[PDB]
Structure formats: C-alpha cells, structure tokens
Design a protein around this nucleic acid. Structure first.
Lengths: 200, 97, 107, 81, 92, 91, 104, 80, 94
DNA sequence: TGGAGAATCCCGGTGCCGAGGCCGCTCAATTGGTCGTAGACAGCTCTAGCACCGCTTAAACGCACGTACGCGCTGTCCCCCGCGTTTTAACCGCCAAGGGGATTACTCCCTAGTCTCCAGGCACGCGTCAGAT
DNA sequence: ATCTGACCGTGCCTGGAGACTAGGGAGTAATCCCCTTGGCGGTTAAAACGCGGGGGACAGCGCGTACGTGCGTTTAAGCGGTGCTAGAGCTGTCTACGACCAATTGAGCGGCCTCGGCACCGGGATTCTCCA
C-alpha cells in the first residue's frame, strides 16, 4: 500500500498536528478480513505542564508513562480508572499528546454491534472513546509497538473547525476552561456539542 | 452586749432566704442594668414590666444554681469560703465560658 | 344524635378536641390519627394529676389551702422522676429547697 | 446610662449566695459575680431583642424573654407559655 | 380570646384534692408545664414519624415518645393510662 | 440515598484545590450540613409559629442564622446569604 | 434551563434545600429567597470548616484531610467550638493540651 | 455473666491519659465502670425504643445516632 | 525512669492518637449484656457498636478532663472518685 | 452545769383583694357522608449478622520494689463577719402623655398545584499515582 | 525503605425547572386605647462605712503507703475463613382510616359580683446561742 503516513509527518508538536488532525481515518485490521473505514470528528490535546488535566503535568516520570519522550508519535492505548479504554498518540516534548474522542464508521456496523453487547441505536453506539474502544477491538497489547509495522492499525487520508471548552471537568483551576478542543461545525453526529460557541 | 460568734448569722440567713421565695436584687438597679445592656444592641427600646421580672427571675435562679455549684467546689477543696477559682471551675465544668 | 365529647367518650378531663386541633395546626405531621389526641390527653392528665397531688400534699404540710408556686417547686424537686423530667426549668416565685452541706453546720 | 452594674450591691450578692447555701464569701466574689451576670444578660436579651426585631416591634415582651430562655435550655414557667 | 388549660387543671385538682384550690400564678406555671410537655411529646412524635418515613401520628408514636421522654415509673404509668383511654375510646 | 458529597467536594476544590477528603470526613461533612440545616429550619419554623405567619421567607432564615451562630460567623453568614439572595433576585 | 444554584452563584443545591424545606413539615408555605439564603449559609459554613481543616492538614504535612484535621479545625477556632460544642466527631481525638501543674 | 470487668484497668488508664490525667487512684476503675454502665444503659435503652417503633429486631447505627441526639451528644460520621 | 516521666510520654502519645483505646470485643459483649435486659433476642449492626464505642470514649475522655481539673483544684495531681462525683454533679447527671 | 438575751413560734383579731361561681354568647367541636391514598399484609430476595474454628501475638496480668505524694498536724496572720451609725436612694403614690400594639378593610402578588421533559447524579468498573507508613 | 484507599467514560432515571392558573396570606393605612416612660415628693428601709477580733486560709514539715515502673508469664483478642439463615428491604394489592365539607349545638371564655383565705399586727410562751 501507499496511503500510510510516516515519521516525517508524525514528528510534529501538539497544536499544529492537532489542527491538521481532522477527518483522518484510523483503521485497525481486525483479523476477520474486514475494515471499518471510520472518520474522526473530534480530538483532544494536551500541551504539557500548562494544562492541569494532563497526565504528565509538571514533568511526570512515571514508569507507566515512559515511551512518549523516547520518540514522537508513540502509540498509547490506556485505561480510564477501570476497564474503559482510550486512544492516544504522543508528540515531541513533555506532556504533549493528542487523544481520539469520537468516530463515525461507514461499514461493518453489525460486527461492532455484536461485539459491543458483551436499545442498540447507532447514534449512541460510538458516541465516545470507550464506545469505539469496544468497537475497534482495542486491547492492552498495543503499547510497545509503532504505527508502521506489519498489518496492524494505521492511518488513512480521507476526503468548519470550532474550538470548544472542556465538558465534564468542573469549574476548578485556571486551565480547565480554555477552548482548545477542535470539533466540526454543522455535523448532527457529534457527541459533545457547543451551541453557544457556534457564533464564534 | 450580745456578740454572736462568726457563722451563726450566716446560717440564720441561709434558713431565712431558703425558706422564702422573694426576689433578692433590688428591682430598679436591675431594670437600669437591663436597659443599659439593651442600649448596646438596639437603641431606643422599651421593656414590658413582665419582661424585666422574667429576666430577674431567670438571673436570680441562675446565680443561685451557680452559687450552689461554687459552694460544692469550695467544699471539695476542704474550705468553707468561696473564691473566684470556685466560680471559674464551676463555669468550666458546666461549659459556660 | 346527642353529641358526646371525645373526652367524655375516653373517660378523660383534658380536651381531646383541643389537643387534636393543636396537633393539626402545630405542623407535626401531615396527618394526625384518631387515637393520638386521646393518648396524649391521657398522658397530660396523668402528669397534671401527679404534680397536683404532691403540690396539694405540700400545701397541706404548710397549713395552707391553696397552691402557690413554692408548693409546685417543692412538689417537683422532691420527686426524682418529676425532677429529672423538669431539670432545666425555673418555676417563677419558686425558691429553693432547704439544704445545707454538713461541713457548714457547727460541731 | 453608665456604671449600673454597681447597683447590684454586695449585700444583694450575699443574699443570693446564702440562698444558694454559701456560708462564707471572699471579697473578690462580688466583682466576679457581676461579670457572670453580665455574660448571662448579654446572652439572653441579645436573643430577645432579636425576637423583637423580627416582629417589627419596639417593646421587648415577656414572652420574647421566655423564648430566649428556652433557646438556651433555661426554660421559664409562669410568664406565658 | 386567649386559650388556656385552666378549667381542666381545676377539674383534675378537684378530682385528686377536693378541698384544695389554687392561685393565678400556679395556673401560669401549670399551663406552661402542660404546653411544654405537649410540645416535647409532639416534637418527638414528629421526629419518630419522620424517621420511619410515615405521614401519620398515631397512638403508637405518642406511646414511643412517652417512653422516650418520661423516666421509668412515670412512663409506665403514662402508657397504662393512655392505652386505657384509647381502648375505652375505641370500645365506646 | 442522597448526600451533599459532590457539593462539599466542589466547596473543597474552590477553597483548597490541592487537598483531598477521605470517606469518613465526607460523612462528617454530610452530617454537619444536615445538622445545621435542621437547626436553622427548626428555628425558622418556631419563628413562623410565634409570629403567626405560615411562610418561611429569607427574613426568618436570616434571624435564625443570627440566633444560632456565634458573632463573627453569624455576621459573615448573614452577609453571604444577603449577597446570594440579592444576586438571585436581580437575575 | 438554568439551575438556581448557578442563578445565585452558589455551589449548593437550591432545589434540594427547597424540597427538604417543603417535605420537612417546617411550615405550610416556603419562600423563594429562603432556600437561597439557607444554601448560602450552609456553603459559607462548610467553606470555613474546610478551609480550617485544610490548614490543619497542611500543618501536619498531609495532603488529604482526615477526621483528626476536622476536630483540630473545629476545636481550635472559638466560634466553631461554640457552635459544635455538644457534638462529638468520630475518630477525632482531642486537642493536645497538657495542664501546667503536671509538667516538672 | 460479668462483662463490665472486660473494660480493663489499662483501658481506663489509656482513656485517662488521653484526658490529661497524670495519676490515677485505685478506686477510679470501679467508679468509671459504673459511669460507662449508666451512660451505655441510657443510650441503649433509647436505641432499643427506636428499634421497637421501627418494628425491627436489629439495632441500626441510625438508632444509636438518634438516641445520642436525644441526650444532646450528637455523633458525626455514622450517617447523622 | 523516675515516676511521672513515662506518664507524660503516654499522655503526649495518646493525645496525638486517634484510635479507640477501649477494646472492641469486650465492649461489644458489654453492649449485648446491657441490651439483653431491655429486649430479648436483639441484633446489632457493626456500625451501631462502633458508634456506641466512639460516644462512650468521647464521654469518658471529657469526664476525665473535668475530673483532672477538679483534682488540680484541690491541690492534688491524683484523681479520686470524689473528683468524678463532683464533676458529674456539676454537669448535672447525679 | 445555770442563766441572760435575742430569735423564732404561736395564739387571736382585722381587713382586703383575689379566687370561685353564675351567666350570656360566640365559635369551635361533633355528627354524617364522600373520596382518596397511606399504610397494613403477604411474599420473595439476598445482605449481613451470627457461631465457630486454629494461630500468633500484643496486651493484660501478677508480682517486687521504691519514691513521690496524699494527708494529718501546726503556727501565723490576714481577711471577712458581726454590729452600730450615717448617708443614700429604692419605693410607694399619683399624674400626664404620647408612642406603640391591636384591629379592621382591601387589595395583590407570591406561592401551591400540575404537565412535560431533560440534564444532573448516583451506581459502576478496577491499575496505579501519589499518599501514607 | 515499603503498604494502600481514592481517581475521567457509560447507561439511565428521576427529580428539578419552565409555563400557566388560582386564591389567600401578607402588606398597607386609618383609628383606637392600654400602658410604659418620665417626673415630684415624702418616708424609711436598705446599703455603706468603720472597727474589732475570731477563725480559717495557707504555708511548711514529716511520715506512711500506695501507685508508678519494669519484667516474666498467659490469655484471649484480632485477623482470616467457612457455613448458615434471620430478617432488612423492596414490591404488589386492597381496604380501612383520615382529610374535607356543611350543619348544628353546647361549652368554654369574658364580664362581673361576692366572701373567705391569708398576710399582717401584737403580746406572750418557747427555744437557741453564747458564756463564766
């Protein structure tokens, strides 16, 4: 194949890569022989120690979060205080990473519909990161591996951008209310919307 | 003349006052005290006469109970006279500070 | 269809109806039952009789015919159950009981 | 109105003490007792004035003092109820 | 019109002491005693009804309130008098 | 059951952001809020019955706070409640 | 659909306070400013308790408050010791206070 | 059946040393066992009354909290 | 050590402590023995017995504080039963 | 031991003012009837309480010794009690008056009640990160 | 150096909020009458002050003993684990009990008049206290 991004594009900082991270098609080749061809609609960014909600705030050197400063663009699937997973790729620097939030597929709905049921409307079937992590067959065995090896998950280039404030973080701190998360305008399949931010 | 030994008049005063029910503080200094304390909270107040009598009965009963507890505090220290230490200790055990 | 008072039905002197009206317009519950005013009237009648019998005995001990507040103070403070029911009250014009500790009496 | 706490005389405190069963009284009792009385009344009528401030009245009634005493666990019988 | 427990305390006084009267200040004291005991028992019955998620005060609530407030022998005699009154009221 | 846990946590995060509360201390704060609620509501109920008024408005709550709290704490609580009521009425 | 907690600038639920005032049999009718006032008073009191407790935990070099810090906060302040006088705190201990005549 | 003696002498000493006491006489222990027995009897009797009205046979902690609130000894930390 | 030196160390240790100084299972047995005389065949939640333990500990510690001030008032450093009776009478229980 | 002197008690007579009965009338308790829902009663679930079993181990326990401490006795001197005398002002009586509580009439705006709906809030998951030891 | 009790995604659910109607409780104003502040004055009771002297507070000393401290045995709590089932907790159903309303009627409350219990006065018998 040819539509796979390399290390010349993944070696970028947080904000300019996250601004160019709209509509990208994250495809995991699950071994049944099918593909999802799902397009992203919203992402989240962590610049570093400036944001208090980041997991690497103030130069954290935890033994779990150690593969991000070795090389930029590192694959990172990780739990959220339990069994729900989230999808992340890091960047050059300290505490800088981008997280994938919501996807919209075009095919293979029945497979993820059966795999989700471990009442089944497709609007709330993939409206969140833990929903797509239970739809893209995402496990804990995707931590020590790059984005350009063998036949695993990669990126594909598919065919207005509004910055919205964080929802669900509470009214605390001085960096939890800055609008930095980018999401599409006018799409009726977005989980987190901002009606007051549509007028800029 | 006849000269009573110290203590006997005190005991007969204890009999006389514990036998009677009449209020011991003069009413007009207590009325002026109530009005002087009430001047610090709301200026130009007025008092019903029954209110000042109620305050006098409450204050006299409180002082008599405190003097009972003060007396047992003084007897606890193997004394007969009462000191400010006894009033302070009685108020600290009762919780009033 | 002769009217019988609820106190006359319960064999009581305290009013069942007034106790019922006060339980209604005192904001104690949204509903007040039928047996609750009868029971509370009987309890209040018993407590009134218990104070008044001892106050009458105290007034008879002082060779007097009518009960003054001093007799009520003696009746309350000379019964232990009535004293601990009424331990934080001031009977006005009531005085105190005659007691002196033994270390103040002369030898 | 000034220095009316001295109107509660030394024989008045002696009468209240021999009501309470006290045989002998030191000289420093009286001033101390006066202070105690002030701490009582500044705690009682401050409530009662407050009650008078809620009914929009200018007269401190007896029943207000009864309520102020019942708030402090010092319930008074014989002046309404 | 001021309501008071005057004639009822007169009737109980003449029932227990037929040759004994009473003064006006003792009416004030006994009226305040009846009002305070009423407020105490009724407030405890309100708390009991609020605790077990009930909306009705019955004789069971007043019975448990009388048991909670009054000391032992007085409480037992009060419960006996109240249940006698309630049984007589229901049966007649 | 219903508790004041999340609101007490929000008050904590406003006053001390780098501070946490254990479970038992949160239970103590729930008991404290319920106890102060019962005290102020009971004093407001008594002041409704004394003045023969059937409504508990901000005046009874203000004087219940003034009766039930010691001096500087009562003054600041009255000031905060008056500020909240005026801002709510203006909005 | 603005809630009354955000309408008054308060962190406590005005609606839940209003519901507990209605269902608590306090009076027949309740006002509109009364739950706002009561929620503001409760929020101020818990802010003062939490501030003094966090100070007591910071002096003990602990970043999470326990009931001991609450006891130190209440009984080191005079006004809260006056308010919470007849109230005991589970696992609160007592203040370090040694009488003078016992020390040599 | 004498379980009041299970409140040991060093337990009374520990409770006094938290209370600031330096020396303890040998007749303190029986007196404070009687004190604990009276206080516990009062609170347990009120809690059992609450359990009787609730028509239960298990004494809950809420009944103990209500019993201590009745005496004026409010306990925070047990759902009160 | 000299007498009174280890005692002040125990005071400074136990006042900084938090935990329950009375033993849990004999206290539970005493609670059962007291409640047997009121209703037969009772049951207790564990939180009820812990609540009774915390209330009893706080009550006895406050009583011993007042007992200590009664003993210091009588020019003594040893507390005696008369001090407990005096503090309990001034409180109002006796 | 008698005895002087003061204090408390006790008899009978005066007079007053407050308790106690009579009575008219308002107004609140009672009698029937409806109607609605709170609550008693039966039944099932599954949480949590209870009884019991070994182990190890920290705490209770008994004993020995000694020194701090309670407690009794004693001397001193200071402060408070008793009493007479003089100054002070409570108190009783009476009156003026004016401010303030109570009451009634009449609105009128705020809160109860109800329908609909939607966004907070309680229940859930367990690696591990700081947090505590 | 080592143990350990809380941290943003998700289904759903249910109580709070907007909107509309009604009615009654509180606000406002004029009027009325108890009642509370203020003043004058005489009388006499109570407080204030001085002084003497008894007696208790207080400091010091000595002694007996009784608690503190420490050490070795001992014992039964504490923690963990297993089995069993009583009873808390919830749900459905039906019906009995209370809220509410209207008519009726008697009883309790205010007004009012009358006489007797009780405070007071005064001389005489009794008792207490101090004393040589």
């Amino acid at each position: 194949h040819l539509t796979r991004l390399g290390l010349e594009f993944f070696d970028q900082p947080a904000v300019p890569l996250a601004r160019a991270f709209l509509g990208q098609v994250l495809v995991r080749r699950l071994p049944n022989g099918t593909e999802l061809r799902g397009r992203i609609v919203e992402t989240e960014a962590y610049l570093g120690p400036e944001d208090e909600a980041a997991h690497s705030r103030g130069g954290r050197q935890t033994p779990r979060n150690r593969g991000m400063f070795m090389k930029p663009g590192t694959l990172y699937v990780y739990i959220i205080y339990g069994m729900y997973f989230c999808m992340n790729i890091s960047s050059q620097g300290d505490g800088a990473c981008v997280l994938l939030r919501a996807l919209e597929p075009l095919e293979g709905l029945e497979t993820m519909r059966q795999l989700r049921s471990t009442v089944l409307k497709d609007r709330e079937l993939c409206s969140g990161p833990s929903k797509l992590c239970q739809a893209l067959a995402i496990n804990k065995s995707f931590d020590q591996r790059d984005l350009a090896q063998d036949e695993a998950v990669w990126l594909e280039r598919g065919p207005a951008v509004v910055a919205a404030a964080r929802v669900g973080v509470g009214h605390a701190g001085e960096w939890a209310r800055k609008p930095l998360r980018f999401y599409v305008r006018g799409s009726p399949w977005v989980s987190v919307v901002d009606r007051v931010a549509e007028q800029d | 003349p006849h000269r009573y030994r110290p203590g006997t008049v005190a005991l007969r005063e204890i009999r006389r006052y514990q036998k009677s029910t009449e209020l011991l503080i003069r009413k007009l200094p207590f009325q002026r005290l109530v009005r002087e304390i009430a001047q610090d909270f709301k200026t130009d107040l007025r008092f019903q006469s029954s209110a000042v009598m109620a305050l006098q009965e409450a204050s006299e009963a409180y002082l008599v109970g405190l003097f009972e507890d003060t007396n047992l505090c003084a007897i606890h220290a193997k004394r007969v006279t009462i000191m400010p230490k006894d009033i302070q200790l009685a108020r600290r055990i009762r919780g009033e500070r | 269809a002769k009217a019988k008072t609820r106190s006359s039905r319960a064999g009581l002197q305290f009013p069942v109806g007034r106790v019922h009206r006060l339980l209604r317009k005192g904001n104690y519950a949204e509903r007040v039952g039928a047996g609750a005013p009868v029971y509370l009237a009987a309890v209040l009648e018993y407590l009134t009789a218990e104070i008044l019998e001892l106050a009458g005995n105290a007034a008879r001990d002082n060779k007097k015919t009518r009960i003054i507040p001093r007799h009520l103070q003696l009746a309350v403070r000379n019964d232990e159950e009535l004293n601990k029911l009424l331990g934080r009250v001031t009977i006005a014009q009531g005085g105190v009981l005659p007691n002196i500790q033994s270390v103040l009496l002369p030898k | 109105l000034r220095d009316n706490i001295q109107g509660i005389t030394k024989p008045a405190i002696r009468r209240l003490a021999r009501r309470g069963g006290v045989k002998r009284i030191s000289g420093l009792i009286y001033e101390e007792t006066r202070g105690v009385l002030k701490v009582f009344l500044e705690n009682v009528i401050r409530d009662a004035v407050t009650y008078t401030e809620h009914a929009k009245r200018k007269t401190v009634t007896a029943m207000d003092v009864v309520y102020a005493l019942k708030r402090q666990g010092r319930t008074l019988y014989g002046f309404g109820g | 019109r001021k309501e008071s427990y005057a004639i009822y305390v007169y009737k109980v006084l003449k029932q227990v002491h037929p040759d004994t009267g009473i003064s006006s200040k003792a009416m004030s004291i006994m009226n305040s005693f009846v009002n305070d005991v009423f407020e105490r028992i009724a407030g405890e019955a309100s708390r009991l009804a609020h605790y077990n998620k009930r909306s009705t005060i019955t004789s069971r609530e007043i019975q448990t309130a009388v048991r909670l407030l009054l000391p032992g022998e007085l409480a037992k005699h009060a419960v006996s008098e109240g249940t006698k009154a309630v049984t007589k009221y229901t049966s007649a």
